[PDB]
Amino acid sequence: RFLKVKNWETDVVLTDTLHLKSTLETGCTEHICMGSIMLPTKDQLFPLAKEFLDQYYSSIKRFGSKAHMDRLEEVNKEIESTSTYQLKDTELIYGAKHAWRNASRCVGRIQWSKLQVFDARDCTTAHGMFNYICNHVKYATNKGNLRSAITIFPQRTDGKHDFRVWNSQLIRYAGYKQPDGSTLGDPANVQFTEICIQQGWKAPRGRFDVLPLLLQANGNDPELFQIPPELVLEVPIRHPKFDWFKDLGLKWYGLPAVSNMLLEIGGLEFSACPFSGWYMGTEIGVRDYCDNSRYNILEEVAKKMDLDMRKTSSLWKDQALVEINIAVLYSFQSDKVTIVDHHSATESFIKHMENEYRCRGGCPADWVWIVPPMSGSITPVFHQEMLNYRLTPSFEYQPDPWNTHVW
């Protein structure tokens, strides 16, 4: 019930108490561990609200004050007559900041407290959503000096009037099925590309086609919008020693911006709440470029390096993987667009973790997502035990909305 985590490279032991305030379920039992599964009324709403306001008022050093009790009352009365309630601004900011503080999969949480929150709760149409979004993108991009941010659309009401961003990320490249039967562009987005084309998008039918936004206001059918090209900062990818690298025609976008999650604060659900930070190199260089199911360019790169591709044991995939990632890092840096490498990101999180242990009594952390997808055991997170548990406020993953929306 008080739990220890050991770092096996340093012998630092941390004691976790924070887990006891754990509320949601993990998917694990004492019989089966699900650590590597990607997806494991007025009545219920008041405890949730209470649990949240309690932590808020504690955080502002006013637990059990006149102002604390007064708010519990007001919220309680609002639920009883309206069946929901509204967060104060200051509460909203705190909820969003803490949702990221609680995100057990996120290696970049050292920054959780620097999050600019944009209150789009007064939003009513897809056009409003687009406007808010363009502002988010421009503010966050900051000409390349990236700033973390989240934009929060109106909370779920009765589930029939949800605001949703249909894209999974604000900025993503189109994927298209080809005559030969292979894939042009990003295969991750085939399904969504076709929907866009089917909503009406004039697809340029290229390899790095920035997709249109699909915006749903008040549970209405969604509409398309192109993001002003001048707002989409992109980076052409070159190697600091391989001259031919640039001839591959590779580019990536500077702004990672998750747009499909559901944000839960004090029992209220914000179903459209797109957020953005900045890339860790490996997310582009390892996953976007190299995954079998993604742009998958290892064979092409390995050939240009004239490596021995006859046997897996020449470690040609590995050698090419490193060079691809040097190139991502080098390009972003050369163009002055913020990026971090896995070494410094993981070093940063270790410091963050130790901060959260002395300041908060722990830090939920999912080791399967925290350890980088290349060079695992030479980053310090590999040797660090982590406890994974669900705390609220949180971000949850949610069903791709076309399986869920009626047309």
Ligand X SMILES: Cc1cc(N)nc(C[C@@H]2CNC[C@@H]2OCCCCOc2cc(F)cc(Cl)c2)c1
Ligand Y SMILES: C[C@H](O)[C@H](O)[C@H]1CNc2nc(N)[nH]c(=O)c2N1
Q: Which of 327, 340, 240, 200 is nearest to 281 (CA)?
A: 340
Q: Tell me if residue 273 is catalytic.
A: no
Q: Is 322 in the site for a copy of itself (CB under 8 A)?
A: yes
Name the segment binding a copy of itself (CB under 8 A); options: 169-177, 223-231, 247-255, 280-288.
Answer: 280-288
Q: How far is residue 91 from each of residues 52, 323, 363, measured CA to CA in Å?
A: 9, 45, 21
Site string for ligand Y, 1-20 (x = CB under 6 A): -------x------------
Q: Tell me if residue 354 is catalytic.
A: no
Q: Is 254 in the site for ligand X (CB under 6 A)?
A: no
Q: What does 253 interact with, of ligand HEM, ligand X, a copy of itself, none (CB < 5 to 8 A by kind)?
A: none
Nearer to a copy of itself, 108 or 154 (CB): 108
Find the binder of ligand Y among 138, 207, 343, 383 (CB under 6 A).
383
Q: Which residues contact 137 (CB under 8 A, 6 or more apart)?
A: 170, 171, 227, 231, 232, 255, 257, 276
Q: Which residues contact 115 (CB under 8 A, 6 or more apart)?
A: 96, 97, 100, 148, 149, 150, 275
Q: Is 291 in the site for ligand Y (CB under 6 A)?
A: no
Q: Breaks in the chain follow which residues, C to N over 2.5 Å?
A: 40
Nearer to ligand Y, 217 or 345 (CB): 345
Phi, psi angle pair for 198, to nearest 5°: -75, -25
Q: Is 35 in the site for Zn ion (CB under 5 A)?
A: yes
CB-hemisphere CA count at 13 Å for 150?
A: 26
Q: What does 100 interact with, of ligand Y, ligand HEM, ligand X, none (CB < 5 to 8 A by kind)?
A: ligand HEM
Burial class (CB in 10 A: 0-12, 13-18, 19+), 256: buried
Query: Which of the following is catalytic: 100, 201, 278, 316?
Result: 278
Whether residue 393 is preceded by a cis peptide bond, meaning omega within 30 degrees of 0, is: yes
Catalytic residues: 106, 109, 278, 283
Per CB under 6 A, residues contacting ligand X are 38-39, 108, 256, 258, 276-277, 279-280, 283, 397
Per CB under 6 A, residues contacting ligand Y are 8, 36, 38, 368-369, 382-385
Per CB under 8 A, residues contacting a copy of itself are 3, 5-6, 8-9, 19, 22, 25-38, 281, 286-287, 290-293, 298, 312-315, 317-319, 321-322, 325-326, 329-330, 333, 341, 343-344, 366-368, 371-378, 380, 382-389
